[PDB]
Every structure is written in structure tokens, then in C-alpha cells.
Design a protein around this nucleic acid. Structure first.
Lengths: 150, 129, 91, 73, 107, 84, 100
RNA sequence: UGUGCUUCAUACGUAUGUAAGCGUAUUACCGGCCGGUACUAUUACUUUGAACAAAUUAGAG
RNA sequence: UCAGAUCAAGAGGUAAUGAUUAAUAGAAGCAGUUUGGGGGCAUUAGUAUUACGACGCGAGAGGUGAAAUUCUUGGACCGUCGUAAGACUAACUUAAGCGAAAGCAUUUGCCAAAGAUGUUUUCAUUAAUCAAGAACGAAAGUUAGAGGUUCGAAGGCGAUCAGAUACCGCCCUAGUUCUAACCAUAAACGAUGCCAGCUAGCAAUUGGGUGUAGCUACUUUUAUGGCUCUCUCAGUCGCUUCCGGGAAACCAAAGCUUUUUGGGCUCCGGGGGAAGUAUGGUUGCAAAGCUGAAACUUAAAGGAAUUGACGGAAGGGCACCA
């Protein structure tokens, strides 16, 4: 593992075999609709909505309580992001390495960490322009980029 | 990364029978590789194996006898017609008494004795003797 | 296009003076004639009037700067050092 | 390490600002900081022998023997 | 051929490690490729100690010890015989022995 | 041991030991807390490795704190582990 | 550029209403409509001091932003420079309760 | 869409290795089970072909 | 009107009305808890080595195989309080850790980043490796400033020696130091490319998790901290031998390269020299770097091991041809 790092450590979620459990849920299964988007209107990316509802409702996995995933439910409401989330956070990192480098030069090991994160924004761009959620003519230019993520 | 499931479940068989274990755990059982063992099951080499059905990719816990000697895969899957099927049994299998080279012919997954009577050709999928 | 491979702004002295002093003055000949971003209103309009004095075309602020660079690194290490002595000696 | 080094620097800077040396050297003549630098930090780590090991007196305020007569007499 | 699996010593997950200076030789040999001797010594030989404890005003005045560390060039520790030319099966033994005597090197 | 051949049916304390991933069928080490905080007894269901703090209707304090692994409740959390 | 108001500005730039500049800001502050006025670091001291004298009269709170003209505009998504903005109806942000 | 059963044709109560019958309709008409007949996601691979000089070569007599 | 055909249907009604898994693949997140001589910038400490200032002392002192050079217009050496400067961060220091590699160690603050663990988080094949091309790259060397203690190529002396442009000894220069650039090589080594699956023991430790009323510091026991054994991930070390392998030395990989085998990808070699030379091209301020032959010559060069040789090789012993 780790395309840009040595550390081959494995860790993930272990989703069980049973699907439709909770067998104890208080309300409708599809009343997570009006709490995916009511916390989607607070600017939360669907990673944060997948874990804020593990503890209040507390729903286990959304793709078994409803029919489909969290990102598909938000654009059924109409809260899909301008740029998808694993590029929104991958660019905000590469923004911050450049803002650290416009005051702290002599640093050839924060610069190296920028070439890493920029060589993989160019790998998620090169894929999202194939599956057509990013259009063509969409590049990483690092002079407009800081007004996207902020 | 795994460019074959068939290599990462046939060396895993072959490494566990030269030590003489009686059960091998293979991962993660493409239906290509189930019908490879089913060729080997009905010629005695393999016991009645069990497919644990977890809904990610699958796992098999394959029983075996100990009659196996070398059960590997050929890669890349060379397309073999019928007239050049014996250039791949001569230089590969130990003698023309026994052993098989398994083919994925146009009809199914079969060995090289059933394919030469049914008159089918295909790709080489692996070998066992 | 690109008109010179290597001289840049010192092709104006062309074949005059020797390659090192052309190379040496070029570092200074670029930063002087540059437009620095104005640290008072934000525009790329902080150009050099005379040696050591820089001014901004809008906002009308003249500053006292370096001979070629707007702010020297030997003087921003004094503006830091003075305010870390000002932090101790005031409060 | 940095949590007890935090804790060793706040108690002894409560002791030093402590009614000048007639109290203070009497503390280290008891090692009274070394018995309170020890029992406080054992909520963080069980610590071994604590030795105060060095004191420089890099600055001296004044000579002024009016403050020396009760100090020597 | 590779005479040791260690090579020098301890060069794993470092790449390159700091050097120290030899004592007798004053080389610049690595810290890990170094015969080290944490030498503890009595100051007064413990045979002329009764001459000194005569002159002790206090409770016979238990004597302080000398403390040093002897970073050694390999070619200048074989020469001073801290280490010597082991057999190829005795080459592999690291921790044995302590197992000699009471306090050595004092004497 | 050429005969660990009850991979078909291992002893359930052995696979309990193994890992959430290294066993034959992956399974979480987690569960869900139907807690009863005695400040006000409205029951909130949280995760054990929580990935989120939680409030209640009446006793809405913190009820859970983040850690590396199992999230520690705040010592006044009369919970009961249950698949309800 | 503290990331606690840069994250909250980018929500008012999608859900909120504002006025992004100085002359529109005093239009709001005279009209009793601004809720919060961010002003830059770089903004000049008279423009600074009469923004706070309007916000004293209009009871709007002024956040002093921690960045220049070039950095308010970037953190507002815009490709120009802002030195003054007045958020008048935030949709989702809780910028009203965020202290300095 | 993998086969299962029901089978029967077929090596010896057993063996289908040709096929037929349930998984709602593996293409609509007339002819005497049978023909004209309407309709064919794709490429690589593979089966048998077509198609093309002789001498050579393999090689029949 | 049939309209051969061809656009759109009165759209509001009848179709289980449509999104496979979620990889012991990856990526990204997290109310996440951390952790590490990782990199940058400030700040700051430690003795030391100098060099000087006082003061006491009295003729020595450096050094070395023996020396001499050298330091004492005695005030040295030494003892002492000092002030100032530049370096270097000991001991703790490990078969520990971090890092892509080169490398990384006084605290404290701030900055940005990282592995790993945890996770009934998110996306859904985004991944693997790689000509060309990019970024970093010990030391030395080079430019341009600021420094300039210690050390010290070069140089200058003193010995030793048949000789001594050397080893040894003295003051030292470029350099070591910091900044802004260049250079792009090291035995840059594990002489061992990267991702992936399998195959075994045994013991330690780095990091995280989870049951030990195992202990245990005391607010009262509890909350924590420390350890205890017991698990568990990613390993890294260590040692023992394979159903391993190899020419061996040896190696849990350097094995699974069966009975010429087959997971994928990339680079390199084809006897020894001539030679990493000539030459062209390219990079460079230079030094030089990345490319890179042939003529002619040659029957061997080489690797791992074995017996003798039995020497500034240590050990244990013997003798009046010692």
C-alpha cells in the first residue's frame, strides 16, 4: 500500500455480514433524508455526515438503511459539492504547503511533500475527468487554487 | 498487486502441500479458479472443498489428499489452438501418461484430454500433475 | 517568443563588460525595474523612483527601501529583532 | 519528558520568587524542593533521585550592608 | 566475503550515524563501530587506600570513583588488547562473558 | 500442525482472539451503547469507537470522549451493551 | 488567515447575503442591516476608524480579519481584493457567536 | 443463466456421453415432425471453411 | 382515406421504474488519541577550547620512540576570578526511533507535513511499475558576501632515515561556520530495485489498540500513572535449523527460479585487458558530470572454500647448538 510512502500498514472498517440491522430504530428508515441534508446545509462533507449520525440517531451504515449512499442522497436533495471531497481536501493540503512556503523557505522537505500531494491531485483529476464529474479543461493551476478551497 | 488470482491461489496450494498440510486457505476465489479446482477435484487430486461466503470477494478452505506434485499457472494466458496443443503438453507435463494442462476453451474450463476429443481450442489456464 | 536564451535584461549591455559582471548586475537589474506588490493597498505598483526610495502610484506612499530590492533581508531581520526587544522592554 | 519538565519549571519558579535566599537556601539545605519535585511528578512518571545539581547567581543586586547586618550578625 | 552479518554494528534504519574520536589513536570512527569501555575506577588504587584513610578526618571517608568512556579505534583496541582475534565460532558470541573475577582493570 | 483443518469450524474463543480482519469472515470489534445517563434518562445510542461526541435531551453534557480505540464514557454513564 | 473564519466565510459565500466592498458596507450600516463587518489588516486607519464608528452607531460587531486585501478576497473565493465586507444574513454559519 | 429436476433416446438395479421437459415469450407466418420465412451489442481468441502459381519440402504410387 | 416509409405521441398512465461488491487494493476524512535526533524559522542553554584583563607564584613549559622546532625583555606553565567571541551539542545513547535517500540530538515557542494504530467514516478501481522529464542529493570543490575558536590539504621549519617532498612535532593558509546561489558525485552498501500472495520456530523491543480489582502513586480506594503477564496490528532486530536454496560463504529470503517456468513492472551484464580512454553531442563559472567505441593484445582474470606456509597475528608452552 501507500503509493507515495513506505508504510504498508493495513487498517480499515470491518463491516459485518448482517445488513438491515438496526432492529431497534426509533423512526422511519428514510428520515435520515431530512438529516443528511439538514446537516448538509451546515456545510458538512459526507464523511462528517457519515459519523455525526453514528452517534445521535445512531445509524450504522446508510447504504443499508436507505437504498443508496450518502453522496447520492445529497444531490437528490441538491447539495453536491462544486469539487468532490477527496479533491477538496487534497487541494487544501497543497494550498497550505504553498502558504507555508511563501514564508518558510530553506525547507526542502516541505517542498518535497508538496510534489507528493500535487502528483496525486493530478491523479484524482486525471480520473474525475474520465468518469465525467469533472469536465475537461479542468486542471490544477496553483494560482487560482486557494480561492476554491477557501 | 494481484495481477492474478490464479497465481495467488495455486502457489498458495503448492506451497502448503510441499509442507504436507491437509487444508489450504485460498483468497479470494474468482469463479475462474473454482472451476480450475473442479477439474482437479474430479481427477482425484483435491478433496471436497468449501466456499466461505463473505460478501466481499469470497474465501475457500480447500481439502486435499497429497497426490499433488506441482500445480501452477501459466501467465500470460496464451491462446492455444488445437494443432499446437501438443507443443504445450510435451515440454511441460512429465510424461504423456498423466498430468493435464487446463484450458479455457470456447465452451468452458477443461483439461487437455477432454478438449482434444470435444475438438475445442482456447487459452492456457494452468497445469497440474 | 523568447528572444534571448540566457542574458535576459542584460542584453542591453550586449558583448560589453564581461560575462560575470553582466551576470552579477542582472540580479539587481531585475529587482530594480520590478513592480513589487504594495504593502499598503495591495497592488503590483510599488516601483522605484531613486536608489533606496520606493513609491506607489496609487495610495501615494513613498517608502525608504534598499538600493535594488524593495525591502532588504538585512532590514527585516532588524524589524523582527527590534520588536522582540520591544516585547521584553515594554511589558 | 516534556510534561514533567513543564512541572519542574513551575514549582521551582514558585519557590524562587520566595522571600530572598534566607528562605531559599534553607529550602535546598533541606532539599525541600526535591521532596516536592518528586511527589508531584509521580502522577506522570515514578521518578528517581532528583538532584538540583547547580545554581549560578549570575546577577547580584546591590552591596548595601543594611541588608547584610541582619544577614550577618 | 561478508565476514559479519553486523558489519560494524547497529547500522539498520539509519543510513549513516555519527562518529566519535578514539582515545589512544584519535581517529574518527563511528559511534556504533566503536569498542566502548565505560571505565569505573577507584581513584586511589585500593592498596594505598589505608594510607589515605589514616588522614581522613571524617568517618574513614568512602572514596569517590573515576568515571570515563573509552571510545576506541578498532585497530587501536586490538593493539591495546581490549579485544583480540577470536575464533570464527567464538566470533558470534556477544553478551558472554562477565563471569571472570571481581573488579578488573583497576587493579 | 498439518491439521488445523477446522477452518470450517474453529473454536469461537480462538477466532475471538485473532483480529477484525485476519479471521475467516471480517467482523467489527465494536457495538452500540444504549446509555442511560442518570442526570436525565433520555437514552442516546452511540458508537463504541465513537467517531463523534454526543448530547442528550436533558443531561446534554459530553457523554463520550475521543481516544485512539474505544471511546471512554465520562464515568457517570450507566450504559448497557445491547443489540436491542 | 485563521481557518476558523475562513471556513465560515466560505459558507456565507454560498448561502448568505453580503455586500463586498466599502461603499456598499456603509450603505448597509446606515440602513441597519449588517450583522458582522470583517475588515482587513491592510485597510487604512481612517477607513478603519469610521467603520468602527459606524459599527458603534449601528451595533454591528467588527471582526478584525488577520490578513491583507489579497487574503480577504482569496478567502471570499474572489479573484479581486476585498478590504471590507458586511454579512447581512448568514444562512448556515454561526459567525454571530465567534469571539476574538 | 449457473444449473437442478423430470425424462428419454444410450456404455453395461446402474452409466446420457446426442436431446427433451420447469425458472412467466431463447424470433412472427404458410407448407408435409419437416421447407420458404422475419429478425442477428461489438472486438480479440478459437473451430471448420473459402480463396489463391509451379518447382522445392512433406511425400502417395 | 390507405398514406411503403419518416418526426414527434392526447405526456398525466399501466411496468419490483433504473446506482453490484465494498478488496487483510487505494484514496480521503475523523468528536480521533497519539508518537518520532523528520524538515523550516525564531528563541535559549551547556561545559569546553582559545584569546585577552586582573592577582598569587616562582623557572620552567609544550611536546616525543628519543628528540628538537616552539613558549618564558623573567611575571610563562599553573592556580584563580573574569569579560568577550566563534565552534561543537558530550555523558544519558540503545542492535532504540524518524526520514524518499543523502541525513537527523541544548531547551522553549510557532509553522507546515508524515507513518502507524483505531474506525458497522467517505468515494468507488481512482491502482502497479516505469524510457523521456522533474524534485532532493554526504563530503570536497566553485561563485558572492558575513564570519573567522578549534582543527587543518597546501606551504614553512625540527627530527627519523642510506633517502623521506612521508608517518611524528610546532605556528598556521584555502577550507570547517552562516547566508544567497552553482555543482550532482561516495564502499550514496544491505555491494541485495518496487508493489503483491504464500511458507517457522524462538526471544526481545518501537508505536497503537483491547480484557488482567495483575500490581499499584494517592484526592479516599476509584479517575490516572508506572510496570505485570495475557492478547493484538505494522514491523524491525536477534538467534536455531528447513519439506528451502546455493559453487560455497551463507540467506524466513538470497525460499516457493517442478523435473530448462510463467504474479506484474523497470534497470543492467555476456572472458580479460586496452578504457569509462579516444571522439561527437550535451550540462557546467571551472573542476568536471550524464552519455560512450575501436585498433591492437590476451589463455586466462575472477568468486566461495581446503591443506600447507606455523611472518608488527594474538594465545598457551618449551631448550645453555636460546
Amino acid at each position: 500500500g501507500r503509493m507515495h510512502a513506505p508504510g504498508k500498514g493495513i487498517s480499515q472498517s470491518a463491516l459485518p455480514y448482517r445488513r438491515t440491522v438496526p432492529s431497534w430504530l426509533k423512526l422511519n428508515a428514510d428520515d435520515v433524508k431530512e438529516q443528511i441534508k439538514k446537516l448538509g446545509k451546515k456545510g458538512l462533507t459526507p464523511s462528517k455526515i457519515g459519523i455525526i449520525l453514528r452517534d445521535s440517531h445512531g445509524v450504522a451504515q446508510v447504504r443499508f438503511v436507505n437504498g443508496n449512499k450518502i453522496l447520492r442522497i445529497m444531490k437528490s436533495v441538491g447539495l453536491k459539492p462544486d469539487i468532490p471531497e477527496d479533491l477538496y481536501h487534497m487541494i487544501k493540503k497543497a494550498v497550505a504547503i504553498r502558504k507555508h512556503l511563501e514564508r518558510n523557505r530553506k525547507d526542502k522537505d516541505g517542498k518535497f511533500r508538496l510534489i507528493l500531494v500535487e502528483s496525486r491531485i493530478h491523479r484524482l483529476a486525471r480520473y474525475y475527468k474520465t468518469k465525467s464529474v469533472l469536465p475537461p479543461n479542468w486542471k490544477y493551476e496553483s494560482s487560482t487554487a486557494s480561492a476554491l478551497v477557501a | 498487486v494481484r495481477m492474478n488470482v490464479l497465481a495467488d491461489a495455486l502457489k498458495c496450494i503448492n506451497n502448503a502441500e510441499k509442507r504436507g498440510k491437509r487444508q489450504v486457505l485460498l483468497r479470494p476465489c474468482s469463479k475462474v479458479i473454482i472451476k480450475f479446482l473442479t477439474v482437479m477435484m474430479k481427477h482425484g487430486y483435491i478433496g471436497e472443498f468449501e466456499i466461505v461466503d463473505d460478501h466481499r470477494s469470497g474465501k475457500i478452505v480447500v481439502n486435499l489428499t497429497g497426490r499433488l506434485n506441482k500445480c501452477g499457472v501459466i501467465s500470460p494466458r496464451f491462446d492455444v489452438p488445437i494443432n499446437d496443443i501438443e507443443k504445450w503438453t510435451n515440454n511441460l507435463l512429465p510424461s504423456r501418461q498423466f498430468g493435464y494442462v487446463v484450458l479455457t476453451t470456447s465452451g468452458g474450463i477443461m483439461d487437455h484430454e477432454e478438449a482434444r476429443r470435444k475438438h475445442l481450442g482456447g487459452k492456457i489456464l494452468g497445469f497440474f500433475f | 517568443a523568447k528572444r534571448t536564451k540566457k542574458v535576459g535584461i542584460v542584453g542591453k549591455y550586449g558583448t560589453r563588460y564581461g560575462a560575470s559582471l553582466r551576470k552579477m548586475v542582472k540580479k539587481m537589474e531585475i529587482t530594480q525595474h520590478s513592480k513589487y506588490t504594495c504593502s499598503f493597498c495591495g497592488k503590483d505598483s510599488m516601483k522605484r523612483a531613486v536608489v533606496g526610495i520606493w513609491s506607489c502610484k496609487r495610495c501615494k506612499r513613498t517608502v525608504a527601501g534598499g538600493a535594488w530590492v524593495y525591502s532588504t533581508t538585512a532590514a527585516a531581520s532588524v524589524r523582527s529583532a527590534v520588536r522582540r526587544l520591544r516585547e521584553t522592554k515594554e511589558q | 519528558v516534556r510534561k514533567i519538565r513543564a512541572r519542574m519549571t513551575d514549582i521551582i519558579t514558585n519557590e524562587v520568587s520566595g522571600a530572598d535566599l534566607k528562605q531559599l537556601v534553607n529550602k535546598l539545605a533541606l532539599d525541600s524542593i526535591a521532596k516536592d519535585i518528586e511527589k508531584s511528578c509521580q502522577r506522570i512518571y515514578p521518578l528517581h533521585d532528583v538532584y538540583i545539581r547547580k545554581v549560578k547567581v549570575l546577577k547580584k543586586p546591590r552591596f548595601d550592608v543594611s541588608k547584610l547586618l541582619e544577614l550577618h550578625g | 566475503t561478508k565476514k559479519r552479518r553486523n558489519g560494524g554494528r547497529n547500522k539498520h534504519n539509519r543510513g549513516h550515524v555519527k562518529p566519535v574520536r578514539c582515545t589512544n589513536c584519535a581517529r574518527c570512527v563511528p559511534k556504533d563501530k566503536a569498542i566502548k569501555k565505560f571505565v569505573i575506577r577507584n581513584i586511589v588504587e585500593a592498596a594505598a587506600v589505608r594510607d589515605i584513610t589514616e588522614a581522613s578526618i571524617w568517618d574513614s571517608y568512602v572514596l569517590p570513583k573515576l568515571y570515563a568512556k573509552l571510545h576506541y579505534c578498532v585497530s587501536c583496541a586490538i593493539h591495546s588488547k581490549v579485544v583480540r582475534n577470536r575464533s570464527r565460532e567464538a566470533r558470534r558470541i556477544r553478551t558472554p562473558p562477565l563471569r571472570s573475577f571481581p573488579k578488573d582493570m583497576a587493579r | 500442525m498439518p491439521l488445523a483443518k477446522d477452518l470450517l469450524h474453529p473454536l469461537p474463543a480462538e477466532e475471538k482472539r485473532k483480529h477484525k480482519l485476519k479471521r475467516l469472515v471480517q467482523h467489527p470489534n465494536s457495538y452500540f451503547m444504549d446509555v442511560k445517563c442518570p442526570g436525565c434518562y433520555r437514552i442516546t445510542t452511540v458508537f463504541s469507537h465513537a467517531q463523534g461526541v454526543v448530547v442528550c435531551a436533558g443531561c446534554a453534557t459530553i457523554l463520550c470522549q475521543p481516544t485512539g480505540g474505544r471511546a471512554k464514557l465520562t464515568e457517570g454513564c450507566s450504559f448497557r451493551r445491547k443489540p436491542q | 488567515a485563521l481557518e476558523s473564519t475562513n471556513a465560515r466565510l466560505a459558507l456565507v459565500m454560498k448561502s448568505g447575503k453580503y455586500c463586498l466592498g466599502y461603499k456598499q458596507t456603509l450603505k448597509t450600516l446606515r440602513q441597519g442591516k449588517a450583522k458582522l463587518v470583517l475588515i482587513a489588516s491592510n485597510t487604512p486607519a481612517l477607513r478603519k476608524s469610521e467603520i468602527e464608528y459606524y459599527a458603534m452607531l449601528a451595533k454591528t460587531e467588527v471582526q478584525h480579519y488577520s490578513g491583507t486585501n489579497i487574503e480577504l478576497g482569496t478567502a471570499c473565493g474572489k479573484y479581486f481584493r476585498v478590504c471590507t465586507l458586511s454579512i447581512t444574513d448568514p444562512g448556515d454559519s454561526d459567525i454571530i457567536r465567534s469571539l476574538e
